[PDB]
Ligand binder design. Sequence first.
Ligand SMILES: [Zn+2]
Lengths: 97, 66, 122, 137, 93, 134, 55
Amino acid sequence: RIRITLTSRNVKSLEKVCADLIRGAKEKSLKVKGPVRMPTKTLRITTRKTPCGEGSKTWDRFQMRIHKRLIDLHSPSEIVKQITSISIEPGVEVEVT
Amino acid sequence: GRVRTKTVKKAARVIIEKYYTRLGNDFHTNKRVCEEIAIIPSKKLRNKIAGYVTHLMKRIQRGPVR
Amino acid sequence: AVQISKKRKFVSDGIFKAELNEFLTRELAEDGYSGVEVRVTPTRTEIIILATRTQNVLGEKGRRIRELTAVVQKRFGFPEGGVELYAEKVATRGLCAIAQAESLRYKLLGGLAVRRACYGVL
Amino acid sequence: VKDVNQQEFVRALAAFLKKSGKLKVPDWVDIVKLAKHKELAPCDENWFYIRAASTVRHLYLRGGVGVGSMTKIYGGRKRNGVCPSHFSVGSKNVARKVLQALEGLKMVEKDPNGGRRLTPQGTRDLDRIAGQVAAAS
Amino acid sequence: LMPKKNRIAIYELLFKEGVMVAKKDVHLAKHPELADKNVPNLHVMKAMQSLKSCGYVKEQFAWRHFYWYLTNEGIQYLRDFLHLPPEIVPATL
Amino acid sequence: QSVQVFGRKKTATAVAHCKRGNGLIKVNGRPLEMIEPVTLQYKLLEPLLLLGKERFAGVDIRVRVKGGGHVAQVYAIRQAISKALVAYYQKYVDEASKKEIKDILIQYDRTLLVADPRRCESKKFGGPGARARY
Amino acid sequence: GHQQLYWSHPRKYGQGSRSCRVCSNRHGLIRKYGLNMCRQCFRQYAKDIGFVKLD
RNA sequence: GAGCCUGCGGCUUAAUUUGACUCAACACGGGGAACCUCACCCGGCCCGGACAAUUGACAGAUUCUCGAUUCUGUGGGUGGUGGUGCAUGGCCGUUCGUAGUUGGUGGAGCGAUUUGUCUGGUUGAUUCCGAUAACGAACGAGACUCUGGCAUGCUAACUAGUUACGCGGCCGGUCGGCGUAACUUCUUAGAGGGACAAGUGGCGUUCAGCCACGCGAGACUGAGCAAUAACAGGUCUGUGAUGCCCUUAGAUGUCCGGGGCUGCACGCGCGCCACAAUGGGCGGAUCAACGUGUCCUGCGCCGACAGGCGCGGGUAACCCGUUGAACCCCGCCCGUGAUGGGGACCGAUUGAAACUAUUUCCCGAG
Ligand SMILES: [Zn+2]
């Protein structure tokens, strides 16, 4: 069995390649496990706005979304090589195992 | 702060003059008409429009609005 | 290997996207540089470059395009042939902010006029 | 050990371990201050039997603890006087000398996981005391 | 105070590929690209500094690093110093 | 053959499992009448003395609580044992009594059946808490 | 010689052992998430790296 | 106000480590001061050195050796925590997030300009209604965006769990640990719903709305982005942002152990109880959450505490971790008292290095 994870930065492009992967896999009559929704991790960086000591203690709250989706697949690796080459888009990282 | 803006005032009036028989005195039925007729990228804005149309319909059946 | 964690992988990616952006805005700012788009794919890292004029960036037989390919592979640690750079020509550059920002900057550095150059891009 | 007063249970279970004088009861650790965040020594003379009964009680509830997490259970608020009071672990040696004492009584087992669940005899003696305190009320 | 044997390793490597990248740090022990020798970082940033002042190389920078490119004139200067025929050509050109 | 109804305080989520027995009211294995906050003893016995002793004799509910604090878990228990009981009267019994138990709980305390939407809002800079400003 | 006294101080720790990877400054450094850049410059590349303000 | 922790004047004089002093100065410069690096202070190795001669040096606070395109081979190549933020940009604060600006056409005036952009009601709002020589729109406001409150409805989960009966002790009941059967209440995150002044009553140019009741997860809130602009309000000490000037090889980059953590009284903000009595103590008992982790830390030896040693997990919903958090809850002790109140001032660990205690702990200390 092969477990391919999907770690991305945008949710709109994550669920797109995730749905395009399971559709490209279920059409080959393969046992695909459901998309596991890993908890998202935000990257908080509270930086002072002004590059000096003048201000009213105004801070800048930054964030960065990190979404991970797990996809398992029990099938030979020869049938999954071409499937991994059709759902590749910028913003999402593919980790085949 | 229950006062609508010009985006809700104008849209709720142009939707009645083009569609009067469509909208009744129910907000939930009027809410579904705006989905098929108008194109709005927000859901909270649609409820404000359909909500004000319901207020206008009570005035229309009562008399001619100004 | 180092087993880069995801919290430090996205940051290491975003810095490579930012450092390559600043290096090209200081080098390709004359040919109308507008940005780059990366696609992290193993053994084939296609790094496209968006410029307004790409015929001069190529050269006689692709001389300047070979340097930048050999420039980032030595600073960021890319193997031989493991990185591929492509040059694309954008359209309607009037909608690109940095394209019009560098446009009138190269004309305001001569002290000609600040009202003619501004109205020229408007 | 539940279904009864957990405070009256350890008050009754400590008296059980006192009658059976088979614990370790170290020579010097039984007369020192218990935790770092504490101010003075425990006012009770048989304090080692009270924490012993409390130690088997927590192992009856949560297993695989070990002496590393036992000091977190008996942690408290440390008085810094002028600095803000914080939380600190209780004591590592007190938990170590009280765990090895129960292993001598065949109540706790050792494991690479650390301080595994109570022995069938350790669980046996706990419910017996739990039944006596229920009948007393 | 720069030796001669390292001068060939820094210029021939810059000849086979017209790109030389060095990090701006005057306290670095050894250059990453110059691993077979013990060439310090000073012998990479200062020996290349004389090429720019004489107009033999073009430099670029991203906050820590130099991006050197052998100009057409600079390659002619290195064709006689490195003792190579006029028929060979670098990889970048 | 069982209903699991959760009770949510600030963070304490208490899910109650509903079964039928002969006078057994325990939470997390421990008996409900012997929880640490002896002060809040009647708060746990609140759905007992106004709902009916004979109507509460043939019910066995075991609650599992996690999160929140001490007092938040107390109000999460009474929120679990009350809603999970009404859900049993409405799913396995008739609604004639399911509304009878519903009316006696509401007339006494609404938060006994409706969770509070109150949560700890995000802190802002420039002050110690949410609104205060040092 | 001079190779045993110049820059001989250990660089293992301290505020000067590390600096910004952009401005080379040693004040307001952000050692979080492997940024290793001063705070006054992180605001300039917050959008380029991906730390956009979703708030 | 009390002791104390830091910040800035004032003093000190190797220099007390500089800017910024109403709002919009004083835990600010993300600056909680051992070295760094520190701009200040004083001593020195030093071409780890160039656009048109040895670097050393056991002998010392000088004897001689070797390398063999870089030596004032003879007026400019350059460095920047050095000045100028009353020369600047970029950013930021503030006015002020108070709600305010602009165009066309038409009207008034010779014209600059004015009307629109308004008496009133309402709204947080130039938000609407209404009025009206103005009409119609734009920016802002709002909408929007991420958050939180519910959805037993859906999409899925051995990197999240419950629930069903079986090997673990007690009295099959009653409580725990160990294994792959059903699906998702609990957990996570995707899609899509839900809340609009919609319903009733009352008050209102019966418009704009407002108020009270229901039903209901709420009659609903907390961020973000934030206009025409202005200030001589800060930033040259955040930048290979920069102009110019000063300083530029006895050096206005370092660096060596470091000196710079400094007091007769006044000032801010902040932690800590007092004026035990609602508190300190001791022993129970029992519940979080965001966030981080190549460093977080789990088990076993042993210190009283602070530590130390070997063995391990975790680049993470996988390990820490079911994050056994404190206050609080319960039992006992203390008691017209500067008391068990108050915690001021007088062995280990980190590193190359703590003296002017870095922190930590022990006893004393009041
Ligand atoms: Zn920087």
